[PDB]
Specification:
Blueprint (H helix, E strand, L loop, with lengths): L1 H14 L6 H7 L8 H9 L3 H4 L15 E3 L2 E9 L3 E8 L4 E8 L13 E4 L2 E5 L2 E5 L3 E5 L10
Parallel strand pairs: 4-7
Antiparallel strand pairs: 1-6, 2-3, 2-5, 3-4, 5-8, 6-7
Length: 153
């Protein structure tokens, strides 16, 4: 019934790398009697993690003191700046901001990639002087957009 269905949906979300708060998951669920992980994910893709996400990044991730970050985990792109292409990404878990550099041959992130886009990081990601080092091996674009995204609330 609704209790066990919410439980198995919550398990599926965590297994996929999402870190949403309990209140966030309720917000993304259209009814306690119509729990559908696809629809929870669709709404979350198109929602600001500052509103629905749970903290999972280390507070000092930009300090240099953190050297690695293990996936799976879903992050949100706040801003993008521009042989493979190289982009600089400002990202957030909804609580802590971090910065990445991304090298992509297959070109699935561009400077046109909308703010609010979600990406999933997989495996162990190196962080070199505060920059996460991303490439096509450890980064998957999940999509979504957060319209009219404001970087600083």
């Amino acid at each position: 019934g609704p209790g066990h269905m919410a439980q198995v949906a919550g398990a599926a979300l965590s297994q996929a790398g999402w870190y949403l708060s309990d209140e966030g998951i309720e917000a993304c669920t259209s009814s306690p009697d119509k729990v559908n992980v696809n629809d929870i994910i669709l709404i979350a893709l198109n929602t600001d993690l500052r509103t629905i996400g749970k903290k999972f990044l280390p507070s000092d991730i930009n300090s240099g003191k953190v050297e690695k970050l293990e996936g799976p985990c879903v992050l949100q792109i706040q801003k993008i700046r521009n042989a493979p292409r190289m982009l600089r990404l400002q990202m957030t878990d909804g609580h802590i901001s971090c910065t990445a550099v991304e090298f992509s041959y297959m070109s699935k992130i561009s400077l046109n990639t909308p703010p609010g886009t979600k990406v999933k990081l997989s495996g162990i990601v190196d962080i070199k002087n505060g920059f996460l080092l991303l490439n096509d091996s450890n980064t998957t674009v999940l999509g979504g957009e957060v319209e009219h995204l404001i970087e600083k609330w």
